[PDB]
């Protein structure tokens, strides 16, 4: 031993819980979700009209 | 936001040839939350602006800024009182808050005791607060006392507070305005004098029973504030004008206040047996 | 957060379009009579399972041999209606796909090959390309506001679709568009608003180029 | 008991690998970089199953070289650090590593 | 350290003339703690070193 640290995290030097005055930080990366495969866009007929209801 | 607090060290004598081990220093923290958004708004039609003489934009902006400042002051004063009412400092190495009592009646805790205070009791409480501030090892600069006009002009007429112009510098340094043996005495209308209830949108503790309050003796570090967005003025004139003819103005600000050091605040109050 | 919301909205629109297209293909498969009286109509192939009542236990009991036999029957039906021998497809879900792959006959290079045990894939059975999709119609569907075409039916016993490129068509009028408001909406409502929108429609063209595989009992 | 762990054969491992591949497909995972960590005993129990190395269907293996490389689209690697014994909490760990891993066989991850 | 997660969105149909309001998005996070410090050490003498013929 031969040393007595201050521990910098205890409050009032009493009890356990030596990580009470430390904060949590932003890692830097956001997870989000996966993109499902979409195959029906092709394999069918696509047309386009400039006016009209049908 | 978090404000860490560091304690104090100790010393001793060294015997030659022996290893040094070291001592420990106490730590603590103070946390201040952030309240909701505070807004002030108004709407002006197009006919009134067409028919008017002067400019109403600047006057309205000034009035909005004034209203926001008044709310901020009231919150800060309530926080100073709450700091004065805290018995135990978060860091054990430091002392806590104090309250000075003035016995003035035979009834229960009522308004007769508050209305029956004379100037001699005010001077005695002032000097007691000064002694207590000296005991707490507070710095000699920036010492203030806040008191309302009735008690202010009750106290000024007293013959003891005269000819005591010495002490720290502080603010209001333009010549001589207000000073008693190092304490600067100022007037304010925003002291907490009524018992206060909780309101939605406040994330701190401002509510308490302040009906016995008389004055506050404090320092510059009793209360702190944390600003997220500063004061900002806005105005819409592109599509609002087309949708309904007129102009809209908003003014908003975001912050929060809390207690930092209860040993830098003292409160004077009047009660009975 | 404004960089992820746009991706999420675009993905949601694409998923909705795919689900609608698959539902329309199934509906074309379920059409009994062609709009032109002479031409033939759609046909469904039934996998008999047991004497149980109509339940999902019949869907859960399907094996790979039944799937292979159903695929061969589908190829026969496609060849009966004088369809071309190119661009035939089959859409199946991963459970049935991996029940089919483990059947070693379809990947045996000694007969016809076109598969790989190591890669865990099958590519072609009876001349029909095989693909996987998670957006097949597998529930019952109810009519919703804003739908001018019939997408609703009961798809509880669906297994897979065997179709062509000419079975279903779509019509587009307005393309995709992303918009964001921040000029005066910010002061009235202290915030921001983002939109994404598109307009189109889908329908059934040739009922005879679509086939439905379903599992039920007697 | 460990008597169940000791009775596993290669057919069970192949079936489990196919089930894992199907479940990975359901969860919308990408089609590349899927791994399977397995200990030498189960690895050489799986190699002895001639179907998984049969080049008639898919190949990707060798009985003489004593190796199998890919099953159902999943890469296969060997490791000696798989968790097999129940673990107790030790001082200095700020996470949760302790559990009862006595029934572990393999891991399929990403 | 904290890793935030973002969920999926939805779709609907618009009626002409009315105003759009908006939908909600699910949120969560994952947290990873920091362990203590691992060490490995050894001490080599000089006499015992001289009782050696290799390095």
Numbering used by the authors:
A (entry chain C): 2 to 55
B (entry chain G): 56 to 328
C (entry chain C): 111 to 328
D (entry chain D): 165 to 274
E (entry chain D): 56 to 110
Task: Provide the publication's sentences verbatim.
Here, we report the cryo-EM structure of the cyanophage P-SCSP1u, a representative member of the MPP-C phages, in its native form at near-atomic resolution, which reveals the assembly mechanism of the capsid and molecular interaction of the portal-tail complex. Overall, the P-SCSP1u virion possesses an icosahedral capsid with a diameter of ~600 Å and a short tail of ~190 Å in length.
The whole capsid of P-SCSP1u is solely composed of 415 copies of major capsid protein (gp19), exhibiting 60 hexameric capsomeres (hexons) and 11 pentameric capsomeres (pentons). As observed in T7 and two cyanopodoviruses (P-SSP7 and Syn5), each asymmetric unit of the P-SCSP1u capsid consists of one hexon and one subunit of penton, yielding a triangulation (T) number of 7 for P-SCSP1u. Although sharing low sequence similarity with the major capsid protein (gp5, 385 aa) of the bacteriophage HK97, the P-SCSP1u capsid protein gp19 presents the HK97-like fold, which was first determined in phage HK9735 and has been discovered in many tailed phages and herpesviruses. The pentons and hexons are assembled by similar intra-capsomeric interactions, with A-domains constituting the core of capsomers and E-loops wrapping around the adjacent N-arms and P-domains, forming a circulating interaction mode to stabilize the capsomer. Overall, the capsid of P-SCSP1u is assembled via non-covalent interactions to maintain the high internal pressure for DNA packaging. Consistently, the Dali Z-scores revealed that seven capsid protein subunits in the viral asymmetric unit of P-SCSP1u show higher similarities with those of T7.
